[PDB]
């Protein structure tokens, strides 16, 4: 069996035998991303992704034979790690001032690349200086990011994601009692931690007006309960909401006070019932698994896959699916479980 270049033709569990290589490659991809070197970034991400799927650790350069997405630049990074136990290249990025600042500024909710470049070019290097500056002005998203900084930079754990899950279902069934709530993202793929909790909401019986208003009702309901700390909606091409919820500690059933609550990033997506298999596939990730799913669909099958449909260009028909298994089968792909999509 020859290893495929597509992550959607590989099984990638959270058991990484090559973390010494993939951690170095992820730093190198992140660096390029923060410099807007998209091509160099995507190239590092594909190499990192293929090594995460390996059932054994690389111990020599010979172990690298037959593996796709392993260019000449990437091979020199691999050899360097085999020789020293560390990547001088990734260590350089870790010591780079632009990398250090961009990673720190974008760690604030509301801060993207244009805001992080602006602050860096003003001579700012710490959040303390940003926050106390009397001339800087911030967006409502950034103020929330600064206000709940420590809680948001703290990992969201599985008991917390479940405590959030209960709050989402309770709020949703108040307006659409037949609605299906599904936890997506890294938590669906078996991750222990995340930076946020994602949910997909859908209703068999709901009308166009009912699905358009549900996220507004859910948030108004949390606002009346005093649980909403921040919210931002985004029109349909799905109805989305990006919140910051107040999560009381008494709601968290873990093995483990000083302020009995934690601010949690929650993302909600409402989708029409007949597009649910596509939305679940699209919102489960990982990001590399999606990119390869769409790349394989286009290059191999002459099909167009997105978050709401699968179109066959040869047959001139949209392909229907009531499940992710049906989408895989239409793509001519063996089914890959959510826990094998950690590409």
From Swiss-Prot:
GO terms for biological process: DNA metabolic process; DNA modification; DNA repair; response to ATP. Can also utilize other divalent cations, such as Mn(2+) and Co(2+) (in vitro). Isoform TDT-L: Expressed in the thymus, and, at lower levels, in the bone marrow. Detected in both cycling and noncycling pro-B and pre-B cells (at protein level). Isoform TDT-S: Expressed in both cycling and noncycling pro-B, but not pre-B, cells (at protein level). Not detected in mature peripheral or germinal center B cells. Residues 4-343 are annotated as: Mediates interaction with DNTTIP2. The keyword Metal-binding applies. Mg(2+) binds at residues 196, 198, 267. This is DNA nucleotidylexotransferase. It comes from Mus musculus. The gene is Dntt. The chain holds residues 148 to 510 of 510 of the full protein.
